[PDB]
Amino acid sequence: QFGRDIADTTDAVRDPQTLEILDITPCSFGGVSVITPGTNTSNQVAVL
Amino acid sequence: AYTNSFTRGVYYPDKVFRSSVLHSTQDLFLPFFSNVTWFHAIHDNPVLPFNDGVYFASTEKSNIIRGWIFGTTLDSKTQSLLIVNNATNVVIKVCEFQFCNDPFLGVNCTFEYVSFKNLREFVFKNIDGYFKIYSKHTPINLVRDLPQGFSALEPLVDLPIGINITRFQTLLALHAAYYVGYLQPRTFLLKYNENGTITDAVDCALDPLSETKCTLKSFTVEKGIYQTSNFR
Amino acid sequence: VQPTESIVRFPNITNLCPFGEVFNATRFASVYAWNRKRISNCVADYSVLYNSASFSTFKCYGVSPTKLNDLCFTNVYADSFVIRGDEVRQIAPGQTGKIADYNYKLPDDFTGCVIAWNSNNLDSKVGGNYNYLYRLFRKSNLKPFERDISTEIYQAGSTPCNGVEGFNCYFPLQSYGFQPTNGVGYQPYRVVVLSFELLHAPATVCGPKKSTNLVKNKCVNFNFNGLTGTGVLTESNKKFLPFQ
Amino acid sequence: YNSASFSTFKCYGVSPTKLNDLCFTNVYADSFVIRGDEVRQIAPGQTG
Amino acid sequence: QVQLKESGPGLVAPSQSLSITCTVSGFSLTRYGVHWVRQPPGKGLEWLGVIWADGSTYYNSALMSRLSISKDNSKSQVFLNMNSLQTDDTAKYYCARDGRGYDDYWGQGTTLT
Amino acid sequence: QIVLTQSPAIMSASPGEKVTMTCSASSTVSFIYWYQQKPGSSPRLLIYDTSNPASGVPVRFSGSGCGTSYYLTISRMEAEDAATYYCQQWNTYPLTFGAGTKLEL
Ligand SMILES: *[C@@H]1O[C@H](CO)[C@@H](O[C@@H]2O[C@H](CO)[C@@H](O)[C@H](O)[C@H]2NC(C)=O)[C@H](O)[C@H]1NC(C)=O
Ligand SMILES: *[C@@H]1O[C@H](CO)[C@@H](O)[C@H](O)[C@H]1NC(C)=O
Ligand SMILES: *[C@@H]1O[C@H](CO)[C@@H](O)[C@H](O)[C@H]1NC(C)=O
Ligand SMILES: *[C@@H]1O[C@H](CO)[C@@H](O)[C@H](O)[C@H]1NC(C)=O
Ligand SMILES: *[C@@H]1O[C@H](CO)[C@@H](O)[C@H](O)[C@H]1NC(C)=O
Ligand SMILES: *[C@@H]1O[C@H](CO)[C@@H](O)[C@H](O)[C@H]1NC(C)=O
Ligand SMILES: *[C@@H]1O[C@H](CO)[C@@H](O)[C@H](O)[C@H]1NC(C)=O
Ligand SMILES: *[C@@H]1O[C@H](CO)[C@@H](O)[C@H](O)[C@H]1NC(C)=O
Incomplete structure (x- = not known):
C-alpha cells in the first residue's frame, strides 16, 4: 500500500478505487x- | 491606469515608539505601485469590499467628507455607525438610524460621545470587533490627480462599535477627490527617522530588486550578485 | 551599586466600577445573542471578590490569581451565559461539541480567565425554564467571537421544504429543560469570561495600591503601571505622540 | 457527535477535530462498567 | 370545550370518611398535568402538587399515613379517600390543571361533611 | 420557604386612593406568580412571569420586585371591589400556597 524513500517520506500510493x-x-x-x-548608478537589473 | 504612486498606503503597524531603526514587520499594507481607485466628486460613490482592513485618504477644500458608515445591509436591520461633523462637536452613535433613499450632504447605541490644500488620511480597521482609528494631517498642493509623496498615519481614536466590517461607502456632496487603498499581508521594512516618523518603505514582494533590498536589510545594494529566494 | 528605596506611582482616579452590576445582576442572556459590556476608569479592589466569592471554579490563562493585584488592564470585557455543566467543560479552548462548533467559539490564544458557579436554586424551573434557547444545525462552523441571529429552515433531503415545515424539514431551535431533582451534570450553570491585553498600552483600571513621591538621580526600584526595574530616572526631550 | 448524551470526550490518540477526516485500519470497542471514582484510573501511568 | 368537572362529591355522614372525584375532557392525562388543592373553612388553601408525563409521583405532606396518589388512568377520574377527612379537612376541594404557562384552568367542587 | 403577609383595614372615600399588596419570604425566591380572587366564590385566574396579564383582565397592571419582597400597583375602578391577592413560589418543592385576608368596602 505504501512506499518509502531513504528519508522515510512517502514514495508512492495505491489508488483505493483503481489498483494502480x-x-x-x-x-x-x-x-x-x-x-x-x-x-x-542605475535601477536596471538582470535575473538568472 | 497605473501611476508612480511609490510608497503610499503605509501606516503605523503598532503603538511602539521607535527611532533611528529599520523595523521588519508583517501586517496588512498597501501593495506598492498597485491599483488604487480614482473617484470624482463633480457634477461615483460605489460600495467597496473591506477585506481585512482598508487604508483611507482624501483631499478636501470644503469639508465634504464628515462621517463614515460601516455595516452589511444598510437597511435598518442591524446596528450602523453614524458620524456627523457639525460645528466643532464630534458626535458618535451606532443606533439603527433610518437613512434616506439617497444620502447626501448639503453645502441601540453602545457608545455615545459629544464634544486641494489639506489631506486628512485615516485608517479604520476592525480586529475582533474593535474599531481602530489612525490619522495624519499634512499640507499638500495638488488637485488634478493622485498626490505624490509619503505620509504615515498615527492612531488617535479607538471606538468600540463591535461591527464586523466587510464593506464601506463614501458620501458625496451634491449641489472632493477621496482615495481608497487596500491592505495585503505583505512584509515591509519601515525606516524611522530621528523624530520617530517613518518616511519610506520597501515592499519585499514588488520585484527581485525589492527582494534583494529586503533580504540585505538596507536601502542601498552594493555591486555584485545575490541569492535571494526560490521559485516554487 | 544596590538600590535604596522603591518608587510606586499610578493614575489618581478612584471610583467603584462596580463589579456587582456585572456579576450580581439578574436575568442575564441566553446562550446565543449573548451580550458584551465594557468597563473603564475604576479601582480594581479584587480583595472584596476574594472574600465574598463562593464560585466553584476559577481557571486563568497567562495569569495567576497571585500576582493579580498591581496589574493595570487596558481593556475589560465581560460576557454572561446560561449553560449546562457539560458545556461548562466544553467552554474550554480547543474542545469539540455543539458549543464549540455552533455557539461561542473561543480561541486558544487568549489571556483571560473564566468563572463558573451553579445557579440551580434560581435558573431552574418547576415545569422547565424554556426561555433558554440553542441552535442545533448549521452548514459550517463559526470563527471566534461572532453571533448569528437567523432562521432559514433546514433541509434534510434533495427536495426543498419550500420555507415551511414538512418532510425532512426542521426548525433549527429547541429548548433546554431544567427541573427540581435535576441531573447534577445537566443542571444549569452561569459562566462569566473576561478578556484583556496586559502590556504596552495606556490603561485605566489599576489595582488598589497607593502611590509615593519619586526621587530623581538615585538607583530605585520603580513600578509604573506594572513595569518594574532598577535604574536612574532623568529628564528627557523625547516628544511622545498621544498614543505612545 | 450530535448525540448530547455523552458527558465527556477526552482523547489521547487523535485530536477531537481530526476524526471527521482521518480514518483507521481497525477499531476495537472495549466495553465494561467501572465505578465513577475510578474513571480517572483508566489512563497510562495510573494505579489502583 | 376544555373542561374540568367534579363528580361524586362527598356528602354528610357521621362516619369521618369522604370521597371526591374529578373528571377531565378535551385533553389527555398523558399530555398535561393536573394539580390538587384544598381549603379548610375560614382559611387559605393547602396544596399537593406533582409534575409528570405519566406514572410519576411527588409528595410533601405534614402527614403521609395511608396517603399516596390514587388515579384511574383511563381518563375517567382521579380519586381521594381518607378515614377521618370529614372532620380534618375538605370543606371544599378544587381540581386544577397546569401547562407550560398562561394556560391554567381551575374547577371547584363542594364537599358536605 | 415560608412567606408572610400584611394587610390593612381601611375605609375609602373615593377611587384613586392607591393600593399596595406585599409579601415577605423566609429565603431567596427567584420566580413568583400573581393571582387575584373575588370573595364569595373562588375561581382562579392568573398573572404570570414578567407580570404580563392573561386574557380577560384590565390593562392597567404593572409588577416589579426586589428580593424577599414583591410589589405590583393598581390605580382605578373595579379592583377596589375585586382584588384579593395571593403569592406563591415555583422554584423548588414544596410549593407553599401562602395565606392571608384582605377586604375593602
Ligand atoms: C463579517 O461580516 C460578514 C458580512 O455580513 C458576515 O458574513 C455574512 O454572513 C451571512 C450569514 O451566513 C451570509 O449570508 C452573508 O453572505 C455574509 N456576507 C458576505 C458579504 O459574504 C460574517 O459572518 C462576519 N464575520 C464575523 C467573524 O463577524
Ligand atoms: C469503486 O471501488 C471499486 C472497488 O474495487 C472499484 O472497482 C472501482 O474502480 C471504484 N470506482 C471508481 C470510479 O474508480
Ligand atoms: C555611490 O554613490 C554614493 C553617493 O553618496 C557615493 O558616496 C559612493 O562612493 C558611490 N559608490 C560607488 C561604488 O560609486
Ligand atoms: C489596474 O488598472 C488598469 C486600468 O486600466 C487595468 O488595465 C489593470 O488590469 C489593473 N491591474 C490589474 C492587476 O488588474
Ligand atoms: C448640528 O446641529 C443640529 C441642530 O439641531 C444638532 O442637533 C446636532 O447635534 C449638530 N451636530 C453635531 C455633530 O453636534
Ligand atoms: C436592540 O437590541 C435588543 C437586544 O437587547 C433587541 O431585542 C432589539 O431588537 C434591538 N433594537 C434595535 C432597534 O436594534
Ligand atoms: C525633529 O524635531 C525637531 C524639533 O525642533 C526639528 O528641529 C527637526 O527638524 C525635526 N526633524 C524632522 C525630520 O522633521
Ligand atoms: C447582591 O445583591 C443583593 C441585593 O440585596 C445583596 O444583598 C448582596 O450583598 C449582593 N452581593 C454582592 C456580592 O454584592
Whole structure:
C-alpha cells in the first residue's frame, strides 16, 4: 500500500478505487539569482 | 491606469515608539505601485469590499467628507455607525438610524460621545470587533490627480462599535477627490527617522530588486550578485 | 551599586466600577445573542471578590490569581451565559461539541480567565425554564467571537421544504429543560469570561495600591503601571505622540 | 457527535477535530462498567 | 370545550370518611398535568402538587399515613379517600390543571361533611 | 420557604386612593406568580412571569420586585371591589400556597 524513500517520506500510493501505483514527484522548484549594479548608478537589473 | 504612486498606503503597524531603526514587520499594507481607485466628486460613490482592513485618504477644500458608515445591509436591520461633523462637536452613535433613499450632504447605541490644500488620511480597521482609528494631517498642493509623496498615519481614536466590517461607502456632496487603498499581508521594512516618523518603505514582494533590498536589510545594494529566494 | 528605596506611582482616579452590576445582576442572556459590556476608569479592589466569592471554579490563562493585584488592564470585557455543566467543560479552548462548533467559539490564544458557579436554586424551573434557547444545525462552523441571529429552515433531503415545515424539514431551535431533582451534570450553570491585553498600552483600571513621591538621580526600584526595574530616572526631550 | 448524551470526550490518540477526516485500519470497542471514582484510573501511568 | 368537572362529591355522614372525584375532557392525562388543592373553612388553601408525563409521583405532606396518589388512568377520574377527612379537612376541594404557562384552568367542587 | 403577609383595614372615600399588596419570604425566591380572587366564590385566574396579564383582565397592571419582597400597583375602578391577592413560589418543592385576608368596602 505504501512506499518509502531513504528519508522515510512517502514514495508512492495505491489508488483505493483503481489498483494502480502512482509516483509522487514534488512540484517544480529552483533558485533565483539577481545580478545588479549599485543603486547609485542605475535601477536596471538582470535575473538568472 | 497605473501611476508612480511609490510608497503610499503605509501606516503605523503598532503603538511602539521607535527611532533611528529599520523595523521588519508583517501586517496588512498597501501593495506598492498597485491599483488604487480614482473617484470624482463633480457634477461615483460605489460600495467597496473591506477585506481585512482598508487604508483611507482624501483631499478636501470644503469639508465634504464628515462621517463614515460601516455595516452589511444598510437597511435598518442591524446596528450602523453614524458620524456627523457639525460645528466643532464630534458626535458618535451606532443606533439603527433610518437613512434616506439617497444620502447626501448639503453645502441601540453602545457608545455615545459629544464634544486641494489639506489631506486628512485615516485608517479604520476592525480586529475582533474593535474599531481602530489612525490619522495624519499634512499640507499638500495638488488637485488634478493622485498626490505624490509619503505620509504615515498615527492612531488617535479607538471606538468600540463591535461591527464586523466587510464593506464601506463614501458620501458625496451634491449641489472632493477621496482615495481608497487596500491592505495585503505583505512584509515591509519601515525606516524611522530621528523624530520617530517613518518616511519610506520597501515592499519585499514588488520585484527581485525589492527582494534583494529586503533580504540585505538596507536601502542601498552594493555591486555584485545575490541569492535571494526560490521559485516554487 | 544596590538600590535604596522603591518608587510606586499610578493614575489618581478612584471610583467603584462596580463589579456587582456585572456579576450580581439578574436575568442575564441566553446562550446565543449573548451580550458584551465594557468597563473603564475604576479601582480594581479584587480583595472584596476574594472574600465574598463562593464560585466553584476559577481557571486563568497567562495569569495567576497571585500576582493579580498591581496589574493595570487596558481593556475589560465581560460576557454572561446560561449553560449546562457539560458545556461548562466544553467552554474550554480547543474542545469539540455543539458549543464549540455552533455557539461561542473561543480561541486558544487568549489571556483571560473564566468563572463558573451553579445557579440551580434560581435558573431552574418547576415545569422547565424554556426561555433558554440553542441552535442545533448549521452548514459550517463559526470563527471566534461572532453571533448569528437567523432562521432559514433546514433541509434534510434533495427536495426543498419550500420555507415551511414538512418532510425532512426542521426548525433549527429547541429548548433546554431544567427541573427540581435535576441531573447534577445537566443542571444549569452561569459562566462569566473576561478578556484583556496586559502590556504596552495606556490603561485605566489599576489595582488598589497607593502611590509615593519619586526621587530623581538615585538607583530605585520603580513600578509604573506594572513595569518594574532598577535604574536612574532623568529628564528627557523625547516628544511622545498621544498614543505612545 | 450530535448525540448530547455523552458527558465527556477526552482523547489521547487523535485530536477531537481530526476524526471527521482521518480514518483507521481497525477499531476495537472495549466495553465494561467501572465505578465513577475510578474513571480517572483508566489512563497510562495510573494505579489502583 | 376544555373542561374540568367534579363528580361524586362527598356528602354528610357521621362516619369521618369522604370521597371526591374529578373528571377531565378535551385533553389527555398523558399530555398535561393536573394539580390538587384544598381549603379548610375560614382559611387559605393547602396544596399537593406533582409534575409528570405519566406514572410519576411527588409528595410533601405534614402527614403521609395511608396517603399516596390514587388515579384511574383511563381518563375517567382521579380519586381521594381518607378515614377521618370529614372532620380534618375538605370543606371544599378544587381540581386544577397546569401547562407550560398562561394556560391554567381551575374547577371547584363542594364537599358536605 | 415560608412567606408572610400584611394587610390593612381601611375605609375609602373615593377611587384613586392607591393600593399596595406585599409579601415577605423566609429565603431567596427567584420566580413568583400573581393571582387575584373575588370573595364569595373562588375561581382562579392568573398573572404570570414578567407580570404580563392573561386574557380577560384590565390593562392597567404593572409588577416589579426586589428580593424577599414583591410589589405590583393598581390605580382605578373595579379592583377596589375585586382584588384579593395571593403569592406563591415555583422554584423548588414544596410549593407553599401562602395565606392571608384582605377586604375593602
Ligand atoms: C463579517 O461580516 C460578514 C458580512 O455580513 C458576515 O458574513 C455574512 O454572513 C451571512 C450569514 O451566513 C451570509 O449570508 C452573508 O453572505 C455574509 N456576507 C458576505 C458579504 O459574504 C460574517 O459572518 C462576519 N464575520 C464575523 C467573524 O463577524
Ligand atoms: C469503486 O471501488 C471499486 C472497488 O474495487 C472499484 O472497482 C472501482 O474502480 C471504484 N470506482 C471508481 C470510479 O474508480
Ligand atoms: C555611490 O554613490 C554614493 C553617493 O553618496 C557615493 O558616496 C559612493 O562612493 C558611490 N559608490 C560607488 C561604488 O560609486
Ligand atoms: C489596474 O488598472 C488598469 C486600468 O486600466 C487595468 O488595465 C489593470 O488590469 C489593473 N491591474 C490589474 C492587476 O488588474
Ligand atoms: C448640528 O446641529 C443640529 C441642530 O439641531 C444638532 O442637533 C446636532 O447635534 C449638530 N451636530 C453635531 C455633530 O453636534
Ligand atoms: C436592540 O437590541 C435588543 C437586544 O437587547 C433587541 O431585542 C432589539 O431588537 C434591538 N433594537 C434595535 C432597534 O436594534
Ligand atoms: C525633529 O524635531 C525637531 C524639533 O525642533 C526639528 O528641529 C527637526 O527638524 C525635526 N526633524 C524632522 C525630520 O522633521
Ligand atoms: C447582591 O445583591 C443583593 C441585593 O440585596 C445583596 O444583598 C448582596 O450583598 C449582593 N452581593 C454582592 C456580592 O454584592
